Amino acid sequence: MNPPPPETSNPNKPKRQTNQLQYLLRVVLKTLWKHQFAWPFQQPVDAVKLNLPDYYKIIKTPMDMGTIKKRLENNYYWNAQECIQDFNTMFTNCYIYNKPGDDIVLMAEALEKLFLQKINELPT
Numbered sequence: 601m602n603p604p605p606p607e608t609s610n611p612n613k614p615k616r617q618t619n620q621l622q623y624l625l626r627v628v629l630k631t632l633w634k635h636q637f638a639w640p641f642q643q644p645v646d647a648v649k650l651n652l653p654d655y656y657k658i659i660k661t662p663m664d665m666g667t668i669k670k671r672l673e674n675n676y677y678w679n680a681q682e683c684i685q686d687f688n689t690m691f692t693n694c695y696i697y698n699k700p701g702d703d704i705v706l707m708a709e710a711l712e713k714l715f716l717q718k719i720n721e722l723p724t
């Protein structure tokens with residue numbers, strides 16, 4: 601079975617607007633979402649649909665950009681680092697489940713490089 605998706609909304613968590621969190625949604629998530637390599641990463645891995653019975657045996661910390669978009673837009677994150685960590689988890693999950701030089705790995709690497717170019721310009 602798939603697990604439930606990660607938590608994305610908690611009314612009890614405190615909420616703040618920051619330049620960094622706005623940039624992570626309006627620039628970083630927007631840019632990666634619209635990339636031609638984004639489609640595998642726009643939603644949780646559906647291991648039932650894809651017939652990957654080992655995916656959630658290997659990947660115990662699932663993450664994806666659909667979840668990251670929800671966390672940003674629901675003010676789930678207090679620290680920009682929480683969001684950056686989730687992007688890193690998503691890329692590393694792909695590197696863990698797959699093998700060096702696989703097509704999906706190259707796609708994740710290209711998205712990670714663009715992520716890093718955008719995080720480079722994270723405002724003060």
Ligand SMILES: CCOc1cc(C2CCN(C)CC2)ccc1Nc1ncc2c(n1)N(Cc1ccccc1)[C@H](CC)C(=O)N2C
Binds near residue numbers: 640650652
């Ligand atoms: C066979 C159909 O595959 C997909 C279709 C859609 C569509 C994309 C367009 N949207 C509008 C609707 C969902 C989204 C995602 C997938 N596939 C998919 N998602 C995530 C990953 C992924 N594949 N693969 C590639 C793979 C698939 C099958 C067997 C071996 C490796 C790997 C393993 C799950 C991966 O790491 N990711 C994140």
